[PDB]
């Protein structure tokens, strides 16, 4: 009876195994755009993905992760609210059972169809495992997905999902360029938060882009064909793998833009 997104093991249950679920800097949150304060001391985001090396795509039973070689400074996030350099280790998505829900962060209570998380760790802590134990260990770039025109740079991901239907299944996934998943603008909101899955560690600087990307209905429909379950188990569709907004408590969301 391990955590998930079902009736009996979903987000409202997680605190029993992970008491930090009720902590002081939990994610996601609702972004109240009118209360977010423009911070002119914030710097432009620096996304340097030209040398990114993807390796694998994995169904881990709660999402699929596109994994990168993070043994060198190849794909890095810096600037913005960040001090130092953060290395890309994986990205994944959260999505809904239909287009009206799926995102984790909300914007003035608006839910998007899905949300992309590009996960980076602070190089001053040596690796990901040590980074998640630090309050400034991770930087996660969050990008909203709405349904409309297709995202061409997403299609290579969509087309491999048939090969990782069930949890624990992986597939080779080299030469994928995550620049193809970015919107035009890098305007963002930022706040201190947590992992949105157990262990829910409070180690993340969140950077949420204001501009969503558009993906096609066909593209998100293929996300929804994945399975939470393992091979030869009863089929449960991997849908609604999002945590709802958590209390903001003593935090301020800052905007990079007016
Ligand atoms: Zn996530």
Curated annotation (Swiss-Prot):
Residues annotated for Zn(2+) binding in this entry: 92, 94, 117
Record PTM Phosphoserine, positions in chain: 163, 170
Cofactor binding description: Zinc. Can also use cobalt(II) with lower efficiency, but not copper(II), nickel(II) and manganese(II).
Catalytic activity annotation: hydrogencarbonate + H(+) = CO2 + H2O; urea = cyanamide + H2O
Biophysicochemical property: pH dependence: Optimum pH is 6-8.
Disulfide bonds: none
PROSITE patterns: ALPHA_CA_1 (PS00162), ALPHA_CA_2 (PS51144)
Function description: Catalyzes the reversible hydration of carbon dioxide. Can also hydrate cyanamide to urea. Stimulates the chloride-bicarbonate exchange activity of SLC26A6. Essential for bone resorption and osteoclast differentiation. Involved in the regulation of fluid secretion into the anterior chamber of the eye. Contributes to intracellular pH regulation in the duodenal upper villous epithelium during proton-coupled peptide absorption.
Protein name according to UniProt: Carbonic anhydrase 2
Lineage of the organism: Eukaryota, Metazoa, Chordata, Craniata, Vertebrata
């Amino acid at each position: 009876h391990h955590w998930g997104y079902g009736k009996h093991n979903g987000p409202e249950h997680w605190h029993k195994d992970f008491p930090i679920a009720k902590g002081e800097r939990q994610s996601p949150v609702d972004i109240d755009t009118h209360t977010a304060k423009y911070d002119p001391s914030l710097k432009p985001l620096s996304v340097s993905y030209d040398q990114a090396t993807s390796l694998r795509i994995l169904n881990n039973g709660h999402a699929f992760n596109v994994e990168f070689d993070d043994s060198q400074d190849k794909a890095v996030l810096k600037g913005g609210p960040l001090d130092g350099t953060y290395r890309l280790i994986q990205f994944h998505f959260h999505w809904g059972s239909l287009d009206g829900q799926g995102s984790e962060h909300t914007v003035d209570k608006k839910k998007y169809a899905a949300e992309l998380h590009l996960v980076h760790w602070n190089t001053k802590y040596g690796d990901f495992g040590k980074a998640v134990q630090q309050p400034d260990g991770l930087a996660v770039l969050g990008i909203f997905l709405k349904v409309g025109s297709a995202k061409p740079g997403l299609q290579k991901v969509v087309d491999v999902l048939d090969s990782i239907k069930t949890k624990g299944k992986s597939a080779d996934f080299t030469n994928f360029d995550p620049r193809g998943l970015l919107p035009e603008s890098l305007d963002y909101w930022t706040y201190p938060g947590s992992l949105t899955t157990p262990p829910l560690l409070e180690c993340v600087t969140w950077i949420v882009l204001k501009e969503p990307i558009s993906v096609s209905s066909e593209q998100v429909l293929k996300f929804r064909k994945l399975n939470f379950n393992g091979p030869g188990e009863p089929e449960e569709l991997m849908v609604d793998n999002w945590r709802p907004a958590q209390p903001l408590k003593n935090r301020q969301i800052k905007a990079s833009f007016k």
